[PDB]
Design an enzyme around this catalytic site. Sequence first.
Site, PDB file in Angstrom:
ATOM      1  N   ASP A 249       0.938  -1.276  -0.062  1.00  0.00           N
ATOM      2  CA  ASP A 249      -0.016  -0.067   0.059  1.00  0.00           C
ATOM      3  C   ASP A 249       1.021   1.177  -0.021  1.00  0.00           C
ATOM      4  OD1 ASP A 249      -2.351   1.307  -0.003  1.00  0.00           O
ATOM      5  OD2 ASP A 249      -3.085   0.767   1.834  1.00  0.00           O
ATOM      6  N   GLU A 252       3.221   6.454  -2.956  1.00  0.00           N
ATOM      7  CA  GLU A 252       3.212   7.740  -3.529  1.00  0.00           C
ATOM      8  C   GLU A 252       4.340   8.854  -2.625  1.00  0.00           C
ATOM      9  OE1 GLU A 252       0.657   6.311  -2.252  1.00  0.00           O
ATOM     10  OE2 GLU A 252      -0.166   5.480  -3.811  1.00  0.00           O
ATOM     11  N   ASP A 314     -15.517   9.419 -12.225  1.00  0.00           N
ATOM     12  CA  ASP A 314     -14.628   9.831 -11.147  1.00  0.00           C
ATOM     13  C   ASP A 314     -14.348   8.699 -10.323  1.00  0.00           C
ATOM     14  OD1 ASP A 314     -17.556   9.828 -10.926  1.00  0.00           O
ATOM     15  OD2 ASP A 314     -17.338  10.806  -9.054  1.00  0.00           O
TER      16      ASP A 314
HETATM   17  O1  LIG Z   1      -6.186   1.228   4.538  1.00  0.00           O
HETATM   18  C1  LIG Z   1      -6.410   0.225   3.531  1.00  0.00           C
HETATM   19  C2  LIG Z   1      -6.647   0.683   1.969  1.00  0.00           C
HETATM   20  N1  LIG Z   1      -5.330   1.513   1.874  1.00  0.00           N
HETATM   21  C3  LIG Z   1      -5.397   2.104   0.458  1.00  0.00           C
HETATM   22  C4  LIG Z   1      -5.610   0.966  -0.450  1.00  0.00           C
HETATM   23  O2  LIG Z   1      -5.443   1.453  -1.924  1.00  0.00           O
HETATM   24  C5  LIG Z   1      -6.817   0.085  -0.401  1.00  0.00           C
HETATM   25  O3  LIG Z   1      -6.733  -1.137  -1.136  1.00  0.00           O
HETATM   26  C6  LIG Z   1      -6.620  -0.476   1.184  1.00  0.00           C
HETATM   27  O4  LIG Z   1      -5.282  -1.284   1.262  1.00  0.00           O
END
Ligand SMILES: OC[C@H]1NC[C@H](O)[C@@H](O)[C@H]1O
Lengths: 496, 618
Positions: A249, A252, A314
């Site tokens: 996750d 960025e 969106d």
């Molecule tokens: O906090 C969990 C959430 N964070 C952002 C990710 O893009 C999701 O798939 C998920 O893992």
Amino acid sequence: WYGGAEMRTQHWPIRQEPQPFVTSDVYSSDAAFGGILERYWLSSRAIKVNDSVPFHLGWNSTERYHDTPYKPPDVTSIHKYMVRRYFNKPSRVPAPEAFRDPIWSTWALYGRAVDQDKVLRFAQQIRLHHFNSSHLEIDDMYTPAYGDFDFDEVKFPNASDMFRRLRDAGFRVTLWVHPFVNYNSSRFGEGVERELFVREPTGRLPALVRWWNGIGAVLDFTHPKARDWFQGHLRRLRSRYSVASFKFDAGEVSYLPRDFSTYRPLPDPSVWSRRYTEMALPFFSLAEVRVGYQSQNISCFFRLVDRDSVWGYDLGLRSLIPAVLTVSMLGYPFILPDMVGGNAVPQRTAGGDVPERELYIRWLEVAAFMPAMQFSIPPWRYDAEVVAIAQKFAALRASLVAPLLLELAGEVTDPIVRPLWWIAPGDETAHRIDSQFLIGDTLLVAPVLEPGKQERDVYLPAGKWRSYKGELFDKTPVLLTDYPVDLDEIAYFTWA
Amino acid sequence: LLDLKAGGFSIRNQKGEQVFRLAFRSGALDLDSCSRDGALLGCSLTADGLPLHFFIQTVRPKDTVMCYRVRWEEAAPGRAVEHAMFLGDAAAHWYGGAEMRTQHWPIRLDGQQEPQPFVTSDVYSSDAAFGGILERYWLSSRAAAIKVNDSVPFHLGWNSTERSLRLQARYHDTPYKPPAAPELSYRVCVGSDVTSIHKYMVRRYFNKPSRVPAPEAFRDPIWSTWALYGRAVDQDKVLRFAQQIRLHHFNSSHLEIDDMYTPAYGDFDFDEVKFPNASDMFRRLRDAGFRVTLWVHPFVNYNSSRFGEGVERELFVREPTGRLPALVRWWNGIGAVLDFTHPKARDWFQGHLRRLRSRYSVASFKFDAGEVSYLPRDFSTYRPLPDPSVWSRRYTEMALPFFSLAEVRVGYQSQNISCFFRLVDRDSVWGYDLGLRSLIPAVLTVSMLGYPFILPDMVGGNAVPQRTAGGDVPERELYIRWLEVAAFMPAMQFSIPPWRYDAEVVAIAQKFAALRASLVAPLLLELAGEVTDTGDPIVRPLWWIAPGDETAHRIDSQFLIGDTLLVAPVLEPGKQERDVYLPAGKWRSYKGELFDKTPVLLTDYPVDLDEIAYFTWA
Ligand SMILES: OC[C@H]1NC[C@H](O)[C@@H](O)[C@H]1O
Ligand SMILES: *[C@@H]1O[C@H](CO[C@@H]2O[C@@H](C)[C@@H](O)[C@@H](O)[C@@H]2O)[C@@H](O[C@@H]2O[C@H](CO)[C@@H](O)[C@H](O)[C@H]2NC(C)=O)[C@H](O)[C@H]1NC(C)=O
Ligand SMILES: *[C@@H]1O[C@H](CO)[C@@H](O[C@@H]2O[C@H](CO)[C@@H](O)[C@H](O)[C@H]2NC(C)=O)[C@H](O)[C@H]1NC(C)=O
Ligand SMILES: *[C@@H]1O[C@H](CO)[C@@H](O[C@@H]2O[C@H](CO)[C@@H](O)[C@H](O)[C@H]2NC(C)=O)[C@H](O)[C@H]1NC(C)=O
Ligand SMILES: *[C@@H]1O[C@H](CO)[C@@H](O)[C@H](O)[C@H]1NC(C)=O
Ligand SMILES: *[C@@H]1O[C@H](CO)[C@@H](O)[C@H](O)[C@H]1NC(C)=O
Ligand SMILES: *[C@@H]1O[C@H](CO)[C@@H](O)[C@H](O)[C@H]1NC(C)=O
Ligand SMILES: *[C@@H]1O[C@H](CO)[C@@H](O)[C@H](O)[C@H]1NC(C)=O
Ligand SMILES: *[C@@H]1O[C@H](CO)[C@@H](O)[C@H](O)[C@H]1NC(C)=O
Ligand SMILES: OC[C@H]1NC[C@H](O)[C@@H](O)[C@H]1O
């Protein structure tokens, strides 16, 4: 025009003062550039911005080193030339089952409150409704604090027994991880002392960041010690629980501080995103990341940033084909278009609690034809007809789509999901279409992407096309008007 | 009386002596752009033709004082302003500025220093930086004085070759932010004598303490755990210390429990491992007649139980964007620093202090750190601080509710905070580098800046390894000579006690405690009460009463308490005598010798190891 960046509102073709072209989380912003981008734009009339440039992108729809994280130190033929010159290819193919069986995620279904009870109940329901599983993905939050790698014993009183019961029931398991160590993590002190974190500008102390799960430091993936450290905890989770891989996750640089220091200097801040994606490499076979900055040769899956349970462009259903095509163009063939039905966020759901039924079904149908298919909110949340539709599309993916995905995946070492213009580069209609796509050169897909529709217009380019029902269309190009596609169907055609 | 050329200016007094000389060093005036309207001389561009807001305005505030207001304000960013102030010939001596690591009196600055920020720093390890107590104020023996304007993004350097201070305004590479274009502005005042002009400048610029600390702080020794025990202080050691203080028959202003008595830096609760019954310790200390102060600081380390509390309530100094706490390093590790510009962070700090008083009847607190050298380069605060050092002021304000037995070690317009000001840690050496010979310069320097209630750190110094003449503790002669001079200073603090040495040292300390009690303390209390009215310091240089006396201008081995008690301690090893300068007037030695053929240098005046030379006005 095609390429550039994954965006929140994604149109195909592409359709603001110049801001940094850097990996951002665009979930809440139509200004920023998404986690996957390349300085590459392609024209239907048959540009690569140099890597040296402190590159900033703006736009003006009417005509169509200061304040920056940068520090100083035919259409198909030309696209294939540019791709071959500038983008490295994945040298390996992920696990074959990831291209066939549904992935199952705890995230949209349970949220942070995921539990030992809930994981096992989820897996049992997956078996009782007769679905295969590439793997089960345990998401946020299964640790006592963000930065701890060991399971929270309150929510998971016998992790070992859970993993044993899941293994015995034929479930591969992946775990959610991230680059942050929060200040109240048992590992925060460890990170300060071993100097594993991204530093403030003078390069002496950790710099604190805010992400959606709170305040801590971010690991410096340019530091060999910080990498060894991250990897060590991943290898320990595999050793202890036979976990297969990890969902990586964030990534960025919008989550790094404006000015910052790293072990190796990054004149291009987004190279941090690259260095993070490299953590997937030892577990590539079932890994996913949601950022890509010259990450193409990392042979794992690339996930679109969280899709919302809405219809529109969106981050909704109509965003899927544009987003997947955009990312495919940039040299990332192994694409996972997030969650079937979206993440069902309150205030961002057509429905209330879960996506409205018709939206879930139409999404499931288009997702069955994408390189990887991930459920979270499952079919049996709705009714027996939705389960049956999912079973039909699982069977159709297994027999028609999966064998073709595996061949194209082996071939890549060109994208897997291709725009209509790929086979019809001189065709101006094929240039504009956002509601259709190809899998390789031989399978054309036209899903219904609107509510209250049991038909749609389907464009067939030159050459011969055989419908799923066996209709041969050889008077082409042609627009098939009000082509029947009932709630439980998708329009597809095979080359002949 | 001011001669303005293109490259600088000089000022004369009414007797025609040059008392001030200054070179422009970031440009020259185009004099053709200058004009005079009465007392105001203004010039509108430099000799390179760049636009300038330059003026000198003459002001006659009294019959005996002529002042010169000087502004040099450049048109735009990019252009740092530097003026070089010449100290002049060998008969011109200067005083003020900052507490420094190597403290000379009069001011002597060695080698070369590019102008660096005039901000509160910890100078324990640096002969470059400016100490915790400073004012943009310099005084000349020729009766000239300069106050650099509070507005200035002020940077101070020096050039020993031309004997100059480098006065600089700049906004690049600096913790100074413009209030939400560099400007060097100052006032030069000229008087009849050094004492008169100093008193004019003190009355104009420095606030006075409105209150006097506890009377006993001017009489009884303060006892500190720090140099004696270090971080490893504990319940057993505090009580053993207190018992030994009583058995060797010493009074105590209070006992100061230092670093470390908490489980982590940022926790206010006592560590139960080192202090298993804090309550019983405080009860035993109270019953044995001991007032107690506790060491505190502005930091919350990342492994403190209060760190998370501070992040969440947003009590800390932030990074530049002003969203998140900024981490700092201090000598006890890594954490955040409290924002003393934030009402909530102040209430929070105060709450924990009030709880420590309520729970343990603790009297006050020793407020450690306070220097902005421990804040990050660029930083955000609840209220913006264009002058970063105002953070130091805001911290010293935490002493206010407990002023009576509080100490701080920084001062930035902190004069009206009526607590004690401690010299930054003294080393157990003889020399001017934080050693015995630094005491008189440092105390005189701080006294000049409007801080009368001075605590010259620890008798014998802090006995830091590699920085100790002796080894484990200061050599015996150094301890004794230090004890003797400390007995004559406004507050006297032991840590390494007399009975660490031998019975003769205990006896010498008992003699100096008795002499401080009967001679020094009564005079300190009168002068402390007087400050509130006169603004005058307690410890005074010889030139205070003898402003026209060039020997009195140079003396660093003698000082006055008020106008009437002259002190000449031995400040060298292997000496049972020293030269004692007596200025004009009549002086009576402790033995009763009347010296009335003055001024005079008394040569090889006997002062045995267990003695000090003092004289009373007659
Ligand atoms: O906090 C969990 C959430 N964070 C952002 C990710 O893009 C999701 O798939 C998920 O893992
Ligand atoms: C040591 O202290 C004693 C006692 O001090 C007095 O009581 C304390 C609680 C505190 O309130 C002090 O301020 C008091 O003075 C000293 O004996 C006193 O000396 C003072 C003058 O210094 C005198 O006026 C008192 O009458 C004396 N009181 C008593 C009870 O004897 C003694 O002077 C101190 N000795 C030294 C060496 O300082
Ligand atoms: C410190 O001051 C000295 C004396 O003013 C400077 O040395 C002079 O520098 C000028 C520069 O133009 C020379 O032309 C003089 O002849 C020098 N004289 C001597 C004896 O050195 C020196 O430059 C200053 N130092 C710094 C670091 O600014
Ligand atoms: C005590 O001293 C402080 C520090 O100089 C005084 O503070 C200034 O007061 C003026 C007028 O009230 C303000 O406009 C300034 O901003 C203050 N400066 C700072 C740095 O705080 C204070 O007034 C003095 N108080 C008393 C009672 O003398
Ligand atoms: C941990 O930290 C987050 C912010 O980083 C905070 O919201 C939460 O209250 C903390 N949890 C605990 C157990 O202290
Ligand atoms: C499930 O997996 C098996 C074993 O590899 C495979 O033969 C079958 O096609 C899969 N089932 C579906 C519905 O795709
Ligand atoms: C000193 O600063 C004050 C207050 O900012 C300013 O108005 C004043 O004119 C300055 N003095 C000089 C001589 O520049
Ligand atoms: C805090 O960190 C310091 C520095 O390593 C350590 O010695 C101390 O024991 C820690 N304290 C706590 C309570 O964690
Ligand atoms: C401390 O001592 C008193 C008196 O012996 C006792 O009543 C109290 O509970 C003790 N507390 C602790 C912390 O041991
Ligand atoms: O850590 C404590 C130490 N810090 C610096 C102070 O100036 C010393 O007196 C002592 O309190």
